[PDB]
Amino acid sequence: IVNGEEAVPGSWPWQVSLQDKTGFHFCGGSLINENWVVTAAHCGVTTSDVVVAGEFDQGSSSEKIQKLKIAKVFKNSKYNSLTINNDITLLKLSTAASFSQTVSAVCLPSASDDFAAGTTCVTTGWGLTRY
């Protein structure tokens, strides 16, 4: 995020880091339960990538992180790679995340909830903060 700020550590508990086997972060995700993660379909996750939970500082080695294996990748079949529409994939964990003070789930909305233009929300992540 550009123009962002540092979050309080562990304050967005559902926030997960998707990392390749090399350990390089390439995409974010959100735990919706102890067994499933929601992410963007275009991230192109595979069974070889890893779901990391409870992380704040990726440079730290003292964090009690949770490296979770990916059992199966459920790419929304309405996803359109040409147009990036329906960009959602579900990742089922092969090992359940252990919920805690720093690892918990985001709430999901009803199909009909209204979220008004003008409302101030929050987005988080480890993406570039400079382009």
Partner: protein
């Protein structure tokens, strides 16, 4: 990539308003946010856009696409969860 976790509060926009910036690339299962001085950028993809509702953070959007430049004057585009939750639920249900 930065080492520690970042965040930013930003406004939701109407699809109709978005389209003044991204035309027809904007679909019903997408929701726009930003153009307010911060922007989602490479590496943020798949991450969340949440809103507070009845005091609980709720996944309204998933970081999808935006400025090739991460411009903070252009809005970010997010997958719209409301349009996706039905599939989310069937998927959990059968797996």
């Amino acid at each position: 990539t930065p080492d520690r976790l970042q965040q930013a509060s930003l406004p939701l926009l109407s699809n109709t308003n978005c389209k003044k910036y991204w035309g027809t690339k904007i679909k019903d299962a997408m929701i726009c946010a930003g153009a307010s001085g911060v922007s989602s950028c490479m590496g943020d993809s798949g991450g969340p856009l949440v809103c507070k509702k009845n005091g609980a953070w709720t996944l309204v959007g998933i970081v999808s696409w935006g400025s090739s430049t991460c411009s903070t004057s252009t809005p970010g585009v997010y997958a719209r969860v409301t349009a996706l939750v039905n599939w989310v639920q069937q998927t959990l249900a059968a797996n």
